[PDB]
Design an enzyme around this catalytic site. Structure first.
Site, short mmCIF file in Angstrom:
data_model
loop_
_atom_site.label_atom_id
_atom_site.label_comp_id
_atom_site.label_asym_id
_atom_site.label_seq_id
_atom_site.Cartn_x
_atom_site.Cartn_y
_atom_site.Cartn_z
N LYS A 138 0.81 -1.22 0.00
CA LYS A 138 0.00 0.00 0.00
C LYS A 138 0.85 1.28 0.00
O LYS A 138 0.33 2.35 -0.31
CB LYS A 138 -0.99 0.01 1.17
CG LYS A 138 -2.23 -0.85 0.88
CD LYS A 138 -3.36 -0.60 1.86
CE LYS A 138 -4.61 -1.34 1.47
NZ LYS A 138 -4.44 -2.76 1.77
N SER B 216 -7.21 2.59 9.27
CA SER B 216 -6.26 2.50 10.38
C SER B 216 -5.31 1.32 10.21
O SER B 216 -4.41 1.15 11.04
CB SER B 216 -6.97 2.38 11.70
OG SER B 216 -7.88 1.29 11.69
C1 LIG Z 1 -5.14 -3.62 1.14
C2 LIG Z 1 -4.67 -4.99 1.03
C3 LIG Z 1 -5.14 -5.88 0.05
C4 LIG Z 1 -6.28 -5.56 -0.87
O1 LIG Z 1 -6.10 -4.38 -1.70
P1 LIG Z 1 -7.42 -3.67 -2.30
O2 LIG Z 1 -6.89 -2.60 -3.22
O3 LIG Z 1 -8.19 -3.13 -1.14
O4 LIG Z 1 -8.19 -4.76 -3.07
C5 LIG Z 1 -4.61 -7.14 0.02
N1 LIG Z 1 -3.63 -7.55 0.86
C6 LIG Z 1 -3.15 -6.72 1.78
C7 LIG Z 1 -2.07 -7.19 2.70
C8 LIG Z 1 -3.65 -5.41 1.89
O5 LIG Z 1 -3.14 -4.61 2.85
#
Ligand SMILES: *Cc1c(COP(=O)(O)O)cnc(C)c1O
Ligand SMILES: O=C(O)Cc1ccc(-c2ccccc2)cc1
Ligand SMILES: *Cc1c(COP(=O)(O)O)cnc(C)c1O
Ligand SMILES: [Ca+2]
Ligand SMILES: [Ca+2]
Ligand SMILES: [Ca+2]
Ligand SMILES: [Mg+2]
Ligand code: NA
Ligand code: NA
Ligand code: NA
Lengths: 323, 323
Positions: free
Chosen positions: A53, A81
């Protein structure tokens, strides 16, 4: 056409490259032995902040403007969060601006501590959405910040898509990517990228059956969010897909595989024990998908499959209870 | 000259390379930041069987001969249910020969099930060292098999040296290797290889202060084994150095760093949490060494340090104890 283009993904990679890791792709004979397929594991669990992310969060900090009259964001604000808030805080620190996480009063004490631990400021709201929105929009306005949605923000989607630029470079003979889906920012960014560059490569989503809005949406052919908050061990994919990610997923994602809680758990423990990678259970979803009964319907021509191990932010000291 | 030379390592490399993983070297910004050095982590936890021991074990299975007409072993016989035995068992599978483990008849069912899961064949003995030895001898002879010492066998020491052959290729500017030491097969193999190929590279050992025979021996200039079986979380380094590995360690290892139990625990947890690698505590010994006060005083010219993460065979349903 869609809310992002391939050009946006490339602009994101350029924007974020100096501050993220080009994570390795690892292999496992055992998993190769088990699934029928030749597997490659894109190790976003080794990414800065513990999940992919940071890609979308940094792209958002480096590309979004707070206002028509101000080019530079003066803070970041989010209601997330978890992995997103952690990533966004880190991105904010890199750029020397403050981060605010809007948290309900009812949040667990540990969550309040963990937010303060990662260096963000807490702003409290009521459990309610009226309050949540009031508060975040108000914080955004007063701090001259950007509000950065975890999955529907175009700059975030474009950032997540950079995973696919790396995968295609790292695995030139890849036949498919398998991507866990929650809000679909990662899935949509990856799908845009793969389909722009090499559309013969399949893009498959993996999802908990207990939170199967992406499956149901693709089945019905319209956006069908979870009617109620889902209960799943895959805590990072409890969001539904949204209005910006759904059109991409509808048009450019080849198939969606759903997996049971037990399948997620067993695939996570398999990765821990046999690969020695501390993935979070959410990152086990893609592994479960490839091990699942329905994945056997995938053509034997689809041999080289890269699974995104999306995060490693697991609380070994507390969360672990299902083992 | 010693029980092996670098020639033996080159031979082992040719013997085993087609069957073992050329494990990656990973890095960590946080651990660089904590040590003030550029750290490189040689990931033997990803090796087949979950430790580096397949290197020496396979070399031994492919080069030792039984006491029989046929020059090829028709079986392998071991006392070990640990990293050594698991390595030997896999080597036997690669060669299509049975692996037998001699087990006291009073073994718990859990242990026996665990042993059979990795594919060893149990032969029972009486719970005495006399019976253990006599059964192992009988089985070895009747099956036209071999036994392989875990750290003093020349073929094992030579196979272990192949770790360093890879490190020197993967990290061309490396200034030191840090290696956990028990019986010192891995340390001696590595020392031979490093001092033959690039002797300006330092070779440092790391061991628990609770089992500090290597440190004492190097201080005294003579082999001083532990007086009693040591107590340490670092299960894999409970053996003392032996008569075959000592001369090599005496002459070719630059320094020995000892680390307390608490340091081992804290280093192991740091690697789980910040690197997402499920090392066993024995593999945390080397990390603990580079973090320790004594290491901080090492010359700043020794910048690029490769730590061997020697294994990842940790009992997950048992971690709670020290966390
Ligand atoms: C946020 C997240 C996802 C999913 O991503 P999206 O864009 O919400 O589909 C998958 N794995 C992890 C570890 C995440 O933090
Ligand atoms: O059980 C095991 O695999 C460990 C092992 C192997 C060989 C020997 C051994 C000792 C003296 C002479 C020859 C072999 C000791 C222990
Ligand atoms: C066996 C082992 C060691 C020690 O190797 P020696 O050759 O006995 O010194 C270190 N780490 C792990 C994980 C081991 O299995
Ligand atoms: Ca604004
Ligand atoms: Ca879903
Ligand atoms: Ca020792
Ligand atoms: Mg839109
Ligand atoms: Na970088
Ligand atoms: Na945008
Ligand atoms: Na590419």
């Amino acid at each position: 056409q869609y809310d992002i283009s391939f050009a946006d993904v490339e602009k994101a990679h350029i924007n974020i490259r100096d501050s993220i890791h080009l994570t390795p792709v690892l292999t496992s004979s055992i998993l190769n032995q088990l699934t029928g397929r030749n597997l490659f594991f894109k190790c976003e669990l080794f990414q800065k902040t513990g999940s992919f992310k940071i890609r979308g969060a940094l792209n958002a900090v480096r590309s979004l403007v707070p206002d028509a009259l101000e080019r530079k964001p003066k803070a970041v604000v989010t209601h997330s969060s978890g992995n997103h808030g952690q990533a966004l805080t880190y991105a904010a620190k890199l750029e020397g601006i403050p981060a605010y996480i809007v948290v309900p009063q009812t949040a667990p004490d540990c969550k309040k501590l963990a937010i303060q631990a990662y260096g963000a400021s807490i702003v409290y709201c009521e459990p309610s959405d009226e309050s949540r929105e009031n508060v975040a929009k108000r914080v955004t306005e007063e701090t001259e910040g950007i509000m950065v949605h975890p999955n529907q923000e175009p700059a975030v989607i474009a950032g997540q898509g950079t995973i696919a630029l790396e995968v295609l470079n790292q695995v030139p003979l890849v036949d498919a990517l398998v991507v866990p889906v929650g809000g679909g920012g990662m899935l949509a960014g990856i799908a845009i990228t793969v389909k722009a560059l090499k559309p013969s490569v399949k893009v498959y989503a993996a999802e908990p059956s207990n939170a199967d809005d992406c499956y149901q949406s693709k089945l019905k052919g319209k956006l069908m969010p979870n009617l109620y908050p889902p209960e799943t061990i895959a805590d990072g994919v409890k969001s539904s897909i949204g209005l910006n990610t759904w059109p991409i997923i509808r048009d450019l994602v080849d198939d969606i595989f759903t997996v049971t809680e037990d399948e997620i758990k067993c695939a996570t423990q398999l990765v821990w024990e046999r690969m020695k990678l501390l993935i979070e259970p959410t990152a086990g979803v893609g592994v479960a998908a490839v091990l699942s009964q329905h994945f056997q319907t995938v053509s034997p021509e689809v041999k080289n499959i890269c699974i995104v191990l999306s995060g490693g932010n697991v609380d070994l000291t507390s969360s672990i209870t299902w083992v």
